[PDB]
C-alpha cells in the first residue's frame, strides 16, 4: 500500500481535505489506506469511506451508461459500422469500474465485516457489500451474472434481517438499506412488485415511529423517507 507509511489520523484528515476539494479519487485512496491500518472504523470514518467510493463509482457508472448507449445505437439497423473503438472504450471504463468494486468488496471482506458486531457498523457494511455487487451486476453479462446478483441479494438480506431486529424503523441506515434493496429488486432482480412493497412498508413503518424522535433525528429520517416516496412516485 502506497499509504502504508502515512499515519492513520493523517489519512483521515486528508480524506476530509480531499472531500472539500472534490478530489474523490484521492479521498478513496486515503480511506483505503486508513482501512488497511487494520483498526475498526468509527461512524464518521465509515461514512467517509462510503462517500468517497460512492462518488468514484458513481462517475464510472454514469460514463459507462453514456458509452453503452452509444454502443447500442451503433449496433442498430441503419448504422453501417464505426469499428471496435466504442466497444473497446466501454470495456475500458467497465474494467476500471469492476476494479473499484472489487477493491471495496475486498476491504469489506478483509476485514471490515468480520470485525463489525454492532448493528450500526454491520448493517452499514453489509449494505455496502450489496451495493457494490449491485454495481457489478449492472455491467455483468457472463456465466457469473446470476451469482453476482445473488451475492448482492444475500448481502442485502443479511443486512435487512439485522436491521429489523436491532434498529428502529426510522434509523437512517435501515432506511437507506431498504431504499437501495428496493432499487435492487426493481432494476436488477426484475421484481418491481417487491421493490414497491418494500418501499411502501418501509415508509409506513418509519412514519409511525417519527413521534419518538428529536427534531434533528426527524430531519435525518424524513430525508430518506422522501427518497422512498420519490421512487414510489416514479414506479406507480
Amino acid at each position: 500500500g502506497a499509504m502504508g507509511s502515512m499515519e492513520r489520523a493523517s489519512l483521515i484528515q486528508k480524506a476530509k481535505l480531499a472531500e472539500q476539494a472534490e478530489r474523490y479519487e484521492d479521498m478513496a485512496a486515503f480511506m483505503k489506506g486508513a482501512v488497511e491500518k487494520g483498526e475498526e472504523l468509527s461512524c464518521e470514518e465509515r461514512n467517509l469511506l462510503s462517500v468517497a467510493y460512492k462518488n468514484v463509482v458513481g462517475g464510472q457508472r454514469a460514463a459507462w451508461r453514456v458509452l453503452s448507449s452509444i454502443e447500442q445505437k451503433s449496433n442498430e439497423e441503419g448504422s453501417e459500422e464505426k469499428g471496435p473503438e466504442v466497444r473497446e472504450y466501454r470495456e475500458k471504463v467497465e474494467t476500471e469500474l469492476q476494479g473499484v468494486c472489487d477493491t471495496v468488496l475486498g476491504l469489506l471482506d478483509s476485514h471490515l465485516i468480520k470485525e463489525a458486531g454492532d448493528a450500526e457498523s454491520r448493517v452499514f457494511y453489509l449494505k455496502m457489500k450489496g451495493d457494490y455487487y449491485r454495481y457489478l451486476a449492472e455491467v455483468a453479462t457472463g456465466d457469473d451474472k446470476k451469482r453476482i446478483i445473488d451475492s448482492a441479494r444475500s448481502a442485502y438480506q443479511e443486512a435487512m434481517d439485522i436491521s429489523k431486529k436491532e434498529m428502529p424503523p426510522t434509523n437512517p441506515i435501515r432506511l437507506g438499506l431498504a431504499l437501495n434493496f428496493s432499487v435492487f429488486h426493481y432494476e436488477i432482480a426484475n421484481s418491481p412488485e417487491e421493490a414497491i412493497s418494500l418501499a411502501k412498508t418501509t415508509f409506513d413503518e418509519a412514519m409511525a415511529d417519527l413521534h419518538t424522535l428529536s427534531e434533528d433525528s426527524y430531519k435525518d429520517s424524513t430525508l430518506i423517507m422522501q427518497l422512498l416516496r420519490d421512487n414510489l412516485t416514479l414506479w406507480t
Binding site: D131, G176, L179, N180, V183, Y186, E187, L227, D230, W235
Partner: peptide, 5 residues
Amino acid sequence: FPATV
C-alpha cells in the same frame, strides 16, 4: 434513475 444512498 431511481434514488439510492
